[PDB]
């Protein structure tokens, strides 16, 4: 299934210190961050997307179509400049961010009640799990 509606809670958080260091964030940002619990808020239809990361610490917005190339700034997270392009792979939602990073992006998919998550920058894989609330 391709439906990512929903409110989802997270459930499990791994290695999202890597993937922030591959970012370059500071320690100060990384050592605060690492501790949190993160919501993440999909609003799908067609083609439309609209996200939404939150925790106590940070609150990052995106908005996209699938198949359609976007510039964007990534704002409180690294504050770089990106082209961001967010597609199909079967019912894997891929997105792919180029810029100064290699390998930089996301993937999402649904695996019964849970959405999963990958983080990618350089060589560093964030995988996490959340639950439908
Ligand atoms: C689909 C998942 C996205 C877009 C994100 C998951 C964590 C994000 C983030 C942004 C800023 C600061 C920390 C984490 S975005």
């Given at each position: 299934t391709r439906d990512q509606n929903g409110t989802?809670?997270?459930?499990s958080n791994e290695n999202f210190e890597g993937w922030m260091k591959a970012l370059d964030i500071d320690f100060?940002?990384?050592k605060i961050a690492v501790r949190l619990t993160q919501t993440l808020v999909i609003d799908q239809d067609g083609d439309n997307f609209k996200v939404k990361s939150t925790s106590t610490f940070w609150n990052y917005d995106v908005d996209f179509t699938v198949g359609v190339?976007?510039?964007e700034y990534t704002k409180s997270l690294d504050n770089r400049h990106v082209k961001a392009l967010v597609t199909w792979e079967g019912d894997v939602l891929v997105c792919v961010q180029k810029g100064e990073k290699e390998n930089?992006?996301?993937k999402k998919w649904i695996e019964g009640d849970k959405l999963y998550e990958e983080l990618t920058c350089g060589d560093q894989?964030?995988?996490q799990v959340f639950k439908k609330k």
């Open positions: 989802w809670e997270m459930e100060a940002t990384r190339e976007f510039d930089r992006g996301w894989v964030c995988r």
